[PDB]
Amino acid sequence: MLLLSRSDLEKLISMKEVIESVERAFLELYNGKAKVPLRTIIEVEKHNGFILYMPSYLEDSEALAVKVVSLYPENTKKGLPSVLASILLNDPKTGAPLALMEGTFITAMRTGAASGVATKYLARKDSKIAGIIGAGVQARTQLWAVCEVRNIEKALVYDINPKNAKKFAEEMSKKLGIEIKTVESAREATEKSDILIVATTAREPVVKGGWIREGTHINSVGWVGRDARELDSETVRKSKLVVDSKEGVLNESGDIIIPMKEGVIDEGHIHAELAEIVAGVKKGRENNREITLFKSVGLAIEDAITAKLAYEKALEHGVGTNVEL
Amino acid sequence: MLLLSRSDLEKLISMKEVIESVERAFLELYNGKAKVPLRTIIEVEKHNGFILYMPSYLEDSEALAVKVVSLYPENTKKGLPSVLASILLNDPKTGAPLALMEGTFITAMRTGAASGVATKYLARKDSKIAGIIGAGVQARTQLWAVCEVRNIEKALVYDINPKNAKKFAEEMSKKLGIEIKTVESAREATEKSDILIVATTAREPVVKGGWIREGTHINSVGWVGRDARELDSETVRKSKLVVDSKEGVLNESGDIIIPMKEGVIDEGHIHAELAEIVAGVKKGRENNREITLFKSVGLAIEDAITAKLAYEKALEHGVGTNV
Numbered sequence: 097m098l099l100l101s102r103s104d105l106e107k108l109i110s111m112k113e114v115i116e117s118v119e120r121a122f123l124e125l126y127n128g129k130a131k132v133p134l135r136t137i138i139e140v141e142k143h144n145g146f147i148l149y150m151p152s153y154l155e156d157s158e159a160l161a162v163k164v165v166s167l168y169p170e171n172t173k174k175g176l177p178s179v180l181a182s183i184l185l186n187d188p189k190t191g192a193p194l195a196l197m198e199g200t201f202i203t204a205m206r207t208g209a210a211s212g213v214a215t216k217y218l219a220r221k222d223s224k225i226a227g228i229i230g231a232g233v234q235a236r237t238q239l240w241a242v243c244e245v246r247n248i249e250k251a252l253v254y255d256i257n258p259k260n261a262k263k264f265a266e267e268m269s270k271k272l273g274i275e276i277k278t279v280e281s282a283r284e285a286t287e288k289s290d291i292l293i294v295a296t297t298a299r300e301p302v303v304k305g306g307w308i309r310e311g312t313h314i315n316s317v318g319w320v321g322r323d324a325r326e327l328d329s330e331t332v333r334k335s336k337l338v339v340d341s342k343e344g345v346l347n348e349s350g351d352i353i354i355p356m357k358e359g360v361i362d363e364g365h366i367h368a369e370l371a372e373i374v375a376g377v378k379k380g381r382e383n384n385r386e387i388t389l390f391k392s393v394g395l396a397i398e399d400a401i402t403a404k405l406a407y408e409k410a411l412e413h414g415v416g417t418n419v420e421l
Numbered sequence: 422m423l424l425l426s427r428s429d430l431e432k433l434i435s436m437k438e439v440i441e442s443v444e445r446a447f448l449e450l451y452n453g454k455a456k457v458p459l460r461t462i463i464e465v466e467k468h469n470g471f472i473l474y475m476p477s478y479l480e481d482s483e484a485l486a487v488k489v490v491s492l493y494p495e496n497t498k499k500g501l502p503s504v505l506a507s508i509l510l511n512d513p514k515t516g517a518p519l520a521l522m523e524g525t526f527i528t529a530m531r532t533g534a535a536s537g538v539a540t541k542y543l544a545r546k547d548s549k550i551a552g553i554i555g556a557g558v559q560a561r562t563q564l565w566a567v568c569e570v571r572n573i574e575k576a577l578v579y580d581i582n583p584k585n586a587k588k589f590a591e592e593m594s595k596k597l598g599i600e601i602k603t604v605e606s607a608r609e610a611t612e613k614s615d616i617l618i619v620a621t622t623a624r625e626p627v628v629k630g631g632w633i634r635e636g637t638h639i640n641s642v643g644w645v646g647r648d649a650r651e652l653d654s655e656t657v658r659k660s661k662l663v664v665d666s667k668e669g670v671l672n673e674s675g676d677i678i679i680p681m682k683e684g685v686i687d688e689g690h691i692h693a694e695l696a697e698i699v700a701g702v703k704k705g706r707e708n709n710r711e712i713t714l715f716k717s718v719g720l721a722i723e724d725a726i727t728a729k730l731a732y733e734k735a736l737e738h739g740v741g742t743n744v
């Protein structure tokens with residue numbers, strides 16, 4: 097078996113590659129060449145956490161992988177990231193395990209790239225100002241993937257944690273070579289956005305629909321269970337809704353389940369799944385005045401296409417350590 | 422996180438340990454302190470194999486583990502085991518991964534132990550002769566666990582491959598210190614058995630119910646999908662049926678699903694789940710003449726308590742590699 101550490105992975109993969117790869121994974125999913133059973137969620141109520149088991153098999157790409165990822169929103173208080181993951185790659189021909197790789201970095205990369213492909217189809221091409229609510233691990237790759245897809249000029253970041261917003265604005269500004277300024281309310285970041293990035297831990301809405309002007313595109317990736325949401329009901333109803341997967345969002349995302357329980361929206365309010373948009377069967381952004389919202393909770397195909405991408409580059413680069421079991 | 426190889430694991434855990442631990446896991450499951458959602462099976466039709474994802478959380482034992490196990494019946498043609506597994510242990514307090522360990526040895530140990538617990542409650546205490554149909558990997562731990570709970574004197578082994586039965590008879594007899602004789606039909610092994618072990622890869626019945634005499638207890642652990650079976654409908658109908666879990670067997674075991682399609686039995690023919698037997702809520706063996714059948718497909722909690730037993734012994738014994 098081969099081992100790939102976070103240091104190993106950061107070396108191998110870039111966001112432009114991951115954007116292309118996640119896009120192909122969804123095209124493979126639309127053509128009936130993907131087996132993605134709904135992920136299994138075990139809630140650890142005793143320790144305020146979740147653990148998610150996300151297996152998938154992409155038969156054309158021959159990517160047979162499972163990711164074990166956990167969400168503990170209070171982990172940052174113990175010097176630990178909220179999201180920790182591991183990815184296992186198996187050989188489709190024998191079922192033998194091929195690799196164990198650190199999944200935390202890949203989770204952030206594949207999540208940003210998933211919103212990157214959706215941003216290509218749903219965001220105004222002339223978008224230059226991006227607003228970020230929640231300056232955590234996901235927000236960094238979220239903004240990075242948005243910058244790979246649009247000619248972003250300036251970014252606004254709001255967080256309840258002043259350290260996270262400052263560290264984000266400083267470090268990401270040199271990172272992406274764009275100006276990033278911390279703002280001091282979620283209202284301001286939402287009102288001035290051409291593209292809005294929401295990557296929060298909050299269990300109650302932070303984005304009010306009354307702030308969103310026309311022509312803005314929203315990427316929302318936060319998830320803390322089916323009871324939690326970061327967008328109020330007005331935001332969802334007001335937008336042209338695209339989901340990463342209907343089966344996943346409708347079963348896991350309080351951002352959608354709660355407004356439908358209220359009766360503000362129904363299952364038909366979902367315009368399309370991302371797989372239909374990538375395939376060209378369903379259309380993305382059609383005019384300047386619509387407000388587009390991409391709701392993402394995570395799909396296992398993004399881990400498999402990224403893990404096999406990273407695994408095959410390690411072989412070609414001689415990266416990683418071999419182990420016996 | 423810590424890495425544990427088969428060589429690391431093989432020393433650490435014994436069959437007496439795993440039986441005690443698996444029985445405790447089933448009691449924990451009965452008391453509502455286990456989260457064992459039904460496992461996810463992805464069939465790789467393209468390569469004639471299955472891969473199984475088995476997560477579970479035992480909250481009292483604080484064992485949060487997932488096993489990735491695969492079944493490729495044609496692997497023995499490539500010099501590879503039919504069943505290959507990996508087990509990942511996570512920290513319940515942080516969600517952080519604690520260990521990656523080889524699951525092949527643990528799956529054999531926990532599978533034998535699960536039948537070891539069932540045999541203790543369902544088999545006659547005066548059982549002396551054990552019959553084995555299918556002399557593969559699982560059969561060895563199956564007989565070992567039966568030997569840990571009953572005073573077995575002699576074993577009879579039948580396999581469709583005479584090489585496998587002979588190799589089983591030789592190797593297992595030295596390990597367990599009991600006489601083991603090769604027979605040349607499933608009928609003979611079944612007819613003379615006090616306890617019958619069935620652990621085959623067959624997709625069609627190998628044991629006929631007409632062969633089973635009264636007082637026999639059967640452990641059947643084979644699985645090759647819900648369309649495959651190693652027991653004919655008569656063995657199922659004739660027996661008091663105990664399953665490791667109702668949700669798993671009725672969804673995955675052709676040994677049970679097919680006789681229910683025929684109308685020979687219905688859902689009520691399941692006497693009890695193993696968890697109810699361990700808890701004492703349901704009765705085990707009530708008389709000497711009953712024929713008892715334990716149907717096992719595998720349950721994620723048995724992996725979790727065994728993985729955490731081993732992980733916890735590795736730390737105390739300084740075994741494993743950090744990465």
Ligand SMILES: NC(=O)C1=CN([C@@H]2O[C@H](COP(=O)(O)OP(=O)(O)OC[C@H]3O[C@@H](n4cnc5c(N)ncnc54)[C@H](O)[C@@H]3O)[C@@H](O)[C@H]2O)C=CC1
Binds near residue numbers: 207
């Ligand atoms: N493909 C997907 O959809 C995936 C979903 N997620 C979810 O994305 C979200 C972000 O994940 P991470 O960045 O890794 O965690 P993180 O803990 O490192 O960052 C979360 C940020 O949200 C901020 N925040 C929390 N509540 C806020 C509030 N009311 N108002 C303003 N800011 C607030 C926090 O201060 C923190 O900076 C999480 O909800 C996670 O469950 C995580 C990985 C990928």
Ligand SMILES: NC(=O)C1=CN([C@@H]2O[C@H](COP(=O)(O)OP(=O)(O)OC[C@H]3O[C@@H](n4cnc5c(N)ncnc54)[C@H](O)[C@@H]3O)[C@@H](O)[C@H]2O)C=CC1
Binds near residue numbers: 492581
């Ligand atoms: N109940 C549980 O928890 C578990 C279920 N299993 C299943 O147990 C069965 C055996 O597993 P392993 O021993 O690891 O595989 P194995 O390949 O090592 O052994 C299978 C044995 O069955 C024999 N056999 C095959 N067809 C036969 C037939 N018609 N008649 C007589 N003998 C036949 C084969 O010669 C072979 O020796 C498989 O179905 C496996 O999927 C595997 C792990 C645990």
Ligand code: PRO
Binds near residue numbers: 167393
């Ligand atoms: O799918 C994922 O990877 C993220 C992890 C936390 C919740 N969802």
Ligand code: PRO
Binds near residue numbers: 490491492504719720
């Ligand atoms: O429970 C298990 O581990 C075995 C693996 C193959 C089918 N059942």
